[PDB]
Design goal:
The complex is a heterotrimer of chains A (1152), B (120) and C (173). By secondary structure, chain A is mostly helical. Helices cover 65% and strands 0% of the residues of chain A. Chain A folds into 7 domains: 102 residues, Up-down Bundle (Four Helix Bundle (Hemerythrin (Met), subunit A)); 158 residues, no CATH class; 128 residues, Voltage-gated potassium channels. Chain C (Four Helix Bundle (Hemerythrin (Met), subunit A)); 105 residues, Orthogonal Bundle (Helix Hairpins); 122 residues, Four Helix Bundle (Hemerythrin (Met), subunit A); 119 residues, Four Helix Bundle (Hemerythrin (Met), subunit A) (Up-down Bundle), CATH 1.20.120; 139 residues, Helix Hairpins. Chain A has a two-stranded antiparallel sheet. The longest helix of chain A is centred in the N-terminal third of the chain and has 38 residues. The radius of gyration of chain A is 35 Å and the shape is globular. Chain A starts with a helix and ends with a helix. Chain B has 120 residues and is mainly beta. Chain B has one domain. Helices cover 0% and strands 41% of the residues of chain B. In chain B, the strands form 3 sheets. In chain B, strands 2, 5, 6, 7, 10, 11 and 12 form a 7-stranded mixed sheet that branches. In chain B, strands 3-9-8 form a 3-stranded antiparallel sheet, with no helix packed on it. The termini of chain B are far apart. Chain C has one domain. Chain C is built from 1 helix and 9 strands, in the order E-E-E-E-E-E-E-E-E-H. In chain C, a hairpin with a 5-residue loop joins strand 8 and strand 9. In chain C, 17% of the residues are buried. Classes of the chains: A mainly alpha (1152), B mainly beta (120), C alpha+beta (173). At the A-C interface, helix 25 and helix 27 of A face helix 1 of C. Bound molecules: a molecule of 3 linked components (NAG-NAG-BMA) (5 copies), 2-acetamido-2-deoxy-beta-D-glucopyranose (NAG) (2 copies) and sodium ion (2 copies). A molecule of 3 linked components (NAG-NAG-BMA) binds next to loops of chain A. Chain C: GO terms for molecular function: sodium channel inhibitor activity; sodium channel regulator activity; transmembrane transporter binding. Chain C: Belongs to the sodium channel auxiliary subunit SCN1B (TC 8.A.17) family.
């Protein structure tokens, strides 16, 4: 009934035209008739569908199909909008996105994908419930700990009553206006938010003349706060997703002290790693089950032109030439020659710079010309040797034809303005090695499957990103232009806004990347809180779900005399002694810990430094003795064939060399001074000693050989992308600051480098022509910048300097070249998403094979840990516990009845829920009457719980000390009694508000009884407890790595300039601060800021700084060792945390 | 200009009360001191412009001969009301009312046009 | 910046000594205008007497012969933010004993808010003839030597006992 395919095609064309028109930001008035035409086409389709089985009550009508409901809804909304309507024009204009959403229904196959998403969501519900309750518990903990601490600001304390003017010129003093007047705060020069302070000894430090009072509005526009449960929940949801969580980490630790870092470690290793891994694993289970369910369910005219024109056989001399040149190809020596030429070409285009001598750029030009000439000759010889028809029949040869044609078009169009992206098309020649590499062919297979068997799913993802981007653009677009000065102090559009469509797509991409909070704050400040919260939660959930499903689908598609002898055995017996090994482990622990006390606070406690220095001698002596006696016990050949023995001997030898140099008076020499910092490597002997760390490192080293090839492929792919980035951005990363105003000059006063140097000669160093220090200026810097971009940290500065970049020697201007954003988008799509998919798939295959090697057993636990594993596996079954038979008393019988009905359990759970919501309602600056109401309601709750406990004790004390949950109830209720008693009698000699806060936290333990009545949450908690030992071993290895890198930070990156990310707090000057920084870097969060102040140069430093209290001089460290420190830690941390992810994910699969 | 909504056309009885509002929607709700607002009236379309009301840190009524003691302000700038009220309107009052405001925290300077006519 | 260390309490006759007084800002970010004065009194002597004053460009020393031509300044070099107060004594005599007090006067500059603060640190030194090596060094020497020798005897005794037991075991076969 007029359902011919041409109707579908014209509807498709119309819907794409409507999508483009929505993409347009400001619709010109001549497009109003085009929109009317679109509306007419839609209502014509509506007429067709209403004349073809239109009436609702009739079976198989279009009302039965849910998408036709949306069709009718959008038609009726268009009709309402085209005449008088409600005043909210923005909402009714946004309601047109159903037009674009219709693409889901009209395109075949998308309904199945949407359904699949529906089953995945329906499967992940239990983990959502557990996530919500865990986040609520942590929110209560954070609320009761950091209540109002985020407000702590340095208020000018010596209240100047003599000139304390009021708002209305009273000359009088009012308290509530002194505590909120914004210019009574510190606001450290450079930052925007006022500096956070604190009374605690290890908290932030107030300057001379300021207090540490809580005064005024919360930081980050007032959305980073623990004052109320709502913002605490927002902050901990942010911590779970780890979006810009380094800022919250720094703020809370600076306000409430460094000792609360335990809470952040607890939340990261519980709610951030484990909960996210749980979500991912359950979605993976759902998709795998559905995927195997699909597997179960599966159970003339132009030819005559081709024969004449596409065939070049016309003359026998030419035919003979064709045969001869086909012989000349020499296929056994053709592939090798072309691969050698390709490798030479790619490592020749690799060498690229901003500063190029004429000879070097001439060499590059000549080499590129020679290489393109060789490839053109190869193409021409192939065409003449074998017919063009069968040549183009192979897709590989048409790929080569595209490459060679694009190469040829370059020499003709060598004077085209701009178009630097055209010169990077030669990089695709590297892909020709995919015929030789099987793994590069696997990468191409993954890329094809992205747009092949899953082209419909990637189209669904594109449509989702499109509709979210247009919803944002039409909802908050005009708002971002009306409220410009509220978010940006310069009254200009911020870097990331929703005014244009491209910027809206960029922000939705960023939300997909993970950085949602920094824009969600801004759009709250602009256009209301509720709309932004709903829009951003929806876009994050939907986009992350679709991207994760696409990643999983790609992964699954890719997947499928006679004294020496006696003395020797005596030495072997003495080394084999377990007590002796415990002693040597204690000695190595002490020697490793002795390095902690070596920091900037070493001119103090001179007795400690002297004792540690002199105990270093005895430690080195006992380790030398251990090495000698192990030598004697085993034998030279026995000892030197063990890698751990080599490491131990190396450390002992370098320590002995250091002692010999010290005894020779060579301490002050530069060589021995540089060898001194190698003392940080001492804790490595714990690898040989500790069994868990040894097992884990053995597992990683065993997994490396299957992993080097994948890393080689990733390096080649990032090399292609880095050569593209160097071609696009070489030299376009230069500035002209005027440090007094520290403003990058706009390009209307100074444009070239020459004019900036004219300012240089006229002025002094007050104007500086300096680089970004993270740039595309060579392949090495390209790898560094791409690592920052792919880790999603530091990518903001690179992208800003790229989109502002216009010419190699021209001053950058604000977004003259915005469209290079798509370069970073493409890099994240290909080299950070697809390469990650390939890497993860290879890891999964390797780990499956490794597990199948050792009889399907775990590869991260020791033998005793394996016995513990099996014991808990056996004990995890159902135990027929004794039902506690009824006693021989009537009153005891009735009380036992009361305690045995489920109704008693239900009312207690409900009352616990009420107590939990009363914990929720607590807010800062709450009215004192509300505080009293909370006080008495808490007292009533505690008294009722005590009455219940003592009633059950009088019922059966001896056999209710038999259940662990009852013991938990006992401890929480008695500790609540202790807390209330101390609240009543705080008036003593041991007043401690912090311990008071902790004992009030102890109340929160009672709501954990809710998991008793739950089964899936109980099973998941049992899974976490069951997989704990592998987490413990990997955590010890990670902690030891943190220890070594922390000592390295002490030795090298102390005394660096405090510029960005290294402050008076969170620096490398002390052991606590050093592991603060190291743990911040462990999750890769904000490692850009930590790395940045090292990369500066004595133009940005002073090579001779006074540094009072120390003979050490210099203000910043060596850039070369700074990069090696942070890049190597990220790689090492990344490899380790994956094992944590594997240990959690793969263990869960074995459970179900 | 800026977002201003005004009555497109209003008719006033002979000598009756007249109320012509000038609402305005933007960020940064109006404060008292730093905010600057203006009110000008024109006796015809192409005549001269004579400002009659201003508020520079305080309400300033210029007290023109056309508006000696008739124009009064009883609105609410916080509630987006800078309205001017004209009691006992005269036929010579037929003309244009214009409301000029400027918000210090923002940077949007805009105006608003109002047309008033008197029936015989 | 904030590495505050007290000065050594012993000076040897005839040699040089570095009187040390480190008072750091609570926040290194702040810029301050600092100047100092040093007060001194000998053993069995009356109230302190000022000796040297350093105000942001130069050091003025009092005309008392107890310090003329033998006091040089080892603080921060011409930076107007002292942050490091160190008087150096050349050719230490017996008169340079008793109590020293370093007074630090700061004028911290902020956006629109100056602040004047005074910090006083008291340091007591004695002048001797022989550099009495501190008890820490000698106790560390003794402890290291005794620990080394006890470890040697422990290992030797363990080796001897194991050797005797294994000899008694292997003589059976
Ligand atoms: C927060 O506190 C600061 C400092 O007390 C306030 O700034 C000061 O405000 C007073 C009156 O509001 C100003 O006094 C005025 O001085 C002018 C001369 O410039 C004089 O003609 C006036 O009669 C009046 O006395 C004072 O200059 C000003 N100082 C600074 C450094 O800004 C500020 O107003 C307070 N914030 C709020 C919201 O009240
Ligand atoms: C600015 O506002 C404040 C409060 O909003 C005004 O303070 C008020 O000043 C008047 C005039 O002195 C006070 O009235 C008198 O107070 C004395 C106090 O002993 C009392 O004995 C008199 O019987 C009389 O009530 C008034 O109490 C005081 N507070 C309030 C809440 O009104 C201030 O005058 C204002 N300044 C300007 C310049 O507008
Ligand atoms: C940091 O420590 C201080 C004291 O150790 C904490 O209490 C604060 O103490 C000062 C007095 O030394 C209070 O100032 C006074 O407050 C009253 C309140 O009405 C006011 O009327 C007076 O004019 C005077 O300003 C200060 O209020 C008080 N802090 C609070 C929040 O009341 C301080 O709270 C500690 N900072 C923290 C815990 O963040
Ligand atoms: C970099 O930006 C800073 C922004 O402060 C520029 O410094 C400013 O330079 C102007 C030059 O006319 C100074 O004006 C002078 O002020 C003094 C004192 O009021 C007056 O006696 C002079 O007659 C003249 O008007 C201005 O004070 C100064 N600002 C500061 C805070 O010192 C600097 O020139 C810029 N450099 C370059 C290379 O663009
Ligand atoms: C960056 O460098 C280029 C060339 O190296 C500069 O172009 C040159 O700019 C100067 C002045 O900006 C021009 O001199 C003036 O040209 C106008 C005609 O446009 C003439 O009427 C004047 O009498 C004067 O001669 C010069 O002609 C121009 N070069 C060429 C080949 O046209 C450019 O200005 C530099 N960017 C800066 C300084 O920001
Ligand atoms: C305020 O000024 C008066 C001058 O009349 C003075 O006596 C008083 O000590 C000053 N108080 C303060 C806190 O500065
Ligand atoms: C700071 O206080 C000292 C202590 O008396 C005084 O000598 C000096 O003049 C004061 N300086 C300023 C600028 O207030
Ligand atoms: Na971050
Ligand atoms: Na960031």
């Amino acid at each position: 009934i007029l359902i011919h395919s041409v109707f579908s095609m014209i509807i498709m064309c119309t819907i794409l035209t409507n999508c483009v028109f929505m993409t347009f930001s400001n619709p010109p008035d001549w497009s109003k008739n085009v929109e009317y035409t679109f509306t007419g086409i839609y209502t014509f389709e509506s007429l067709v569908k209403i004349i073809a089985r239109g009436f609702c009550i009739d079976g198989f009508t279009f009302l039965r199909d849910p998408w036709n409901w949306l069709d009718f809804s959008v038609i009726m909304m268009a009709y309402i909008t085209e005449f008088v309507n409600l005043g909210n024009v923005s909402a009714l204009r946004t309601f047109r996105v159903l037009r674009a959403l219709k693409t889901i229904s009209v395109i075949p196959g998308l309904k199945t994908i949407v359904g699949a998403l529906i089953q995945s969501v329906k499967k992940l519900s239990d983990v959502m419930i557990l996530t919500v309750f865990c986040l609520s518990v942590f929110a209560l903990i954070g609320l009761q700990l950091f209540m109002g601490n985020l407000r702590n600001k340095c208020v000018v304390w010596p209240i100047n009553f003599n000139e304390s003017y009021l708002e209305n010129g009273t000359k009088g003093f009012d308290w509530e206006e002194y505590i909120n007047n914004k210019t009574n705060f510190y606001t450290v020069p450079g930052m925007l938010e006022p500096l956070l302070c604190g009374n605690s000894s290890d908290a932030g430090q107030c300057p001379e003349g300021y207090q540490c009072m809580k005064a005024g509005r919360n930081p980050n526009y007032g959305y980073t706060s623990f004052d109320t449960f709502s913002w605490a929940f927002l902050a901990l949801f942010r911590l779970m997703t780890q979006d810009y969580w380094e800022n919250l980490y720094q703020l809370t630790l600076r306000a409430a002290g460094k000792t609360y870092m335990i809470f952040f470690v607890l939340v990261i290793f519980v709610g951030s790693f484990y909960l996210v891994n749980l979500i991912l694993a359950v979605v993976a289970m759902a998709y795998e089950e559905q995927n195997q369910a699909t597997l179960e369910e599966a159970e003339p005219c132009w030819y005559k032109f081709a024969n004449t024109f596409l065939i070049w056989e016309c003359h026998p001399y030419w035919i003979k030439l064709k045969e001869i040149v086909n012989l000349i190809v020499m296929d056994p020596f053709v592939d090798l020659a072309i691969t050698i030429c390709i490798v030479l070409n790619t490592l020749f285009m690799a060498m690229e710079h901003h500063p190029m001598t004429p000879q070097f750029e001439h060499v590059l030009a000549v080499g590129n010309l020679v290489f393109t000439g060789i490839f053109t000759a190869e193409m021409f010889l192939k065409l003449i040797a074998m017919d063009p028809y069968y040549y183009f029949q192979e897709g590989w040869n048409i790929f080569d034809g595209f490459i060679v044609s694009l190469s040829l078009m370059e020499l003709s169009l060598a004077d085209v303005e701009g178009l630097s992206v055209l010169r990077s098309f030669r990089l695709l020649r590297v892909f020709k090695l995919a015929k030789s590499w099987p793994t590069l062919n696997m990468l191409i297979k993954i890329i094809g499957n992205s747009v092949g068997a899953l082209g419909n799913l990637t189209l669904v993802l594109a449509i989702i990103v499109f509709i979210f981007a247009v919803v944002g653009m039409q909802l908050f677009g005009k708002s971002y232009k009306e409220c410009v000065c509220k978010i940006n102090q310069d009254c200009e559009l911020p870097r990331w806004h929703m005014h244009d469509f491209f910027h809206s797509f960029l922000i939705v991409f960023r939300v997909l990347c993970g950085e949602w909070i920094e824009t969600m704050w801004d759009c709250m400040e602009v256009a209301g809180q509720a709309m932004c919260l709903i829009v951003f939660m929806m876009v994050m959930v939907i986009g992350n779900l679709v991207v994760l499903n696409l990643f999983l689908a790609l992964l699954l598609s890719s997947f499928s005399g006679k004294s020496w002898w006696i003395l020797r055995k005596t030495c072997f017996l003495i080394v084999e002694h377990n007590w002796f090994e415990t002693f040597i482990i204690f000695m190595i622990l002490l020697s490793s810990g002795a390095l902690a006390f070596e920091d900037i606070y070493i001119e103090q406690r001179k007795t400690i430094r002297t004792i540690l220095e002199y105990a270093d001698k005895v430690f080195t002596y006992i380790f030398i003795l251990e090495m000698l006696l192990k030598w004697t016990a085993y034998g030279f050949v026995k000892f030197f064939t063990n890698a751990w023995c080599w490491l131990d001997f190396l450390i002992v030898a370098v320590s002995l060399v250091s002692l010999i140099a010290n005894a020779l008076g060579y301490s002050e020499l530069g060589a021995i001074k540089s060898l001194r910092t190698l003392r940080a490597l001492r804790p490595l002997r714990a690898l040989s000693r500790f069994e868990g760390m040894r097992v884990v490192v053995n597992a990683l080293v065993g997994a490396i050989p299957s992993i080097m090839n994948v890393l080689l492929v990733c390096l080649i792919f990032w090399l292609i992308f880095s050569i593209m980035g160097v071609n696009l951005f070489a030299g376009k990363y230069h500035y002209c600051f005027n440090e007094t105003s520290e403003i990058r000059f706009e390009i209307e006063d100074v444009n070239n480098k020459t004019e900036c140097e004219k300012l240089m000669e006229g002025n002094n160093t007050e104007i500086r022509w300096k680089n970004v220090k993270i740039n595309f200026d060579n392949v090495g810097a390209g790898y560094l910048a791409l690592l920052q971009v792919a880790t999603f940290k530091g990518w903001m500065d690179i992208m800003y300097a790229a989109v502002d970049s216009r010419k190699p020697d021209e001053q950058p201007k604000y977004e003259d070249n915005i469209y290079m954003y798509i370069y970073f988008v493409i890099f994240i799509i290909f080299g950070s998403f697809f390469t990650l998919n390939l890497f993860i798939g290879v890891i999964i295959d390797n780990f499956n094979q490794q597990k199948k090697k050792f009889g399907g057993q775990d590869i991260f636990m020791t033998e005793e840990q394996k016995k513990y594993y099996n014991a808990m596996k056996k004990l995890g079954s159902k135990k027929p516990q004794k039902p506690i038979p009824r006693p021989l008393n009537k009153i005891q019988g009735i009380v036992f009845d009361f305690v045995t009905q489920q109704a008693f359990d239900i009312v207690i759970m409900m009352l616990i829920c009420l107590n939990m919501v009363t914990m929720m309602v607590e807010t800062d600056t709450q009215s004192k009457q509300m505080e009293n109401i909370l006080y008495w309601i808490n007292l009533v709750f505690v008294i009722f719980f005590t009455c219940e406990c003592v009633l059950k004790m009088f019922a059966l004390r001896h056999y209710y000390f038999t259940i662990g949950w009852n013991i938990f109830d006992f401890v929480v209720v008695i500790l609540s009694i202790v807390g209330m008693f101390l609240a009543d009698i705080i008036e003593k000699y041991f007043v401690s508000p912090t311990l008071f806060r902790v004992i009030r936290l102890a109340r929160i333990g009672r709501i954990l009884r809710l998991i008793k009545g739950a089964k899936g949450i109980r099973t998941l908690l049992f899974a976490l407890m069951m997989s704990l030992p592998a987490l413990f071993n990997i955590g010890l290895l990670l902690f030891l790595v943190m220890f070594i890198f922390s000592i390295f930070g002490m030795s090298n990156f102390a005394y660096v300039k405090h510029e960005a990310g290294i402050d008076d707090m969170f620096n490398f000057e002390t052991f606590g601060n050093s592991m603060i920084c190291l743990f911040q870097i462990t999750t890769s969060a904000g490692w850009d800021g930590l790395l940045l102040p090292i990369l500066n140069r004595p133009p940005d430093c002073s090579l001779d700084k006074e540094h009072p209290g120390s003979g050490f001089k210099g203000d910043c460290g060596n850039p070369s060792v700074g990069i090696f420190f942070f890049v190597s830690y990220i790689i090492i941390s990344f490899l380790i945390v994956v094992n944590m992810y594997i240990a959690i994910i793969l263990e869960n699969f074995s459970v179900a | 200009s800026m977002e201003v909504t005004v009555p497109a056309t209003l008719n006033v009885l002979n000598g009756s009360d007249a109320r012509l509002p000038c609402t305005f929607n933007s960020c940064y709700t109006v404060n008292h001191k730093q905010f600057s607002l203006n009110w000008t009236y024109q006796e015809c379309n192409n005549c001269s412009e004579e400002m009659f009301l201003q508020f520079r840190m305080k309400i300033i009524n210029l007290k023109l001969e056309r508006f000696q003691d008739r124009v009064e302000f009883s609105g609410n700038p916080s509630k987006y009301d800078v309205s001017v009220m004209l009691r006992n309107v005269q036929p010579e009052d037929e003309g244009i009312y214009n409301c000029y405001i400027m918000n210090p925290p923002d940077r949007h300077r805009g105006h608003g046009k109002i047309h008033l006519q008197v029936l015989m | 910046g904030c590495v505050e260390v007290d000065s050594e309490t012993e000076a040897v006759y005839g040699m040089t000594f570095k009187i040390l007084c480190i008072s750091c800002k609570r926040r290194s970010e702040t810029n301050a205008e600092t100047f100092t004065e040093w007060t001194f009194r000998q053993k069995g002597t009356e109230e302190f007497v000022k000796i040297l004053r350093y105000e942001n460009e130069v050091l003025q020393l009092e005309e008392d012969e107890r310090f003329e031509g033998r006091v040089v300044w080892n603080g921060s070099r011409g930076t107007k933010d002292l942050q490091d107060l160190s008087i150096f004594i050349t050719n230490v005599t017996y008169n340079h004993s008793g109590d020293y007090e370093c007074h630090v006067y700061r004028l911290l500059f902020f956006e629109n808010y100056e602040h004047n603060t005074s910090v006083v640190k008291k340091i007591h030194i004695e002048v001797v003839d022989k550099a009495n090596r501190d008890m820490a060094s000698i106790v560390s020497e003794i402890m290291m030597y005794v620990l080394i020798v006890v470890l040697t005897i422990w290992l030797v005794a363990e080796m001897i006992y194991c050797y005797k037991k294994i000899a008694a075991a292997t003589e059976t076969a």
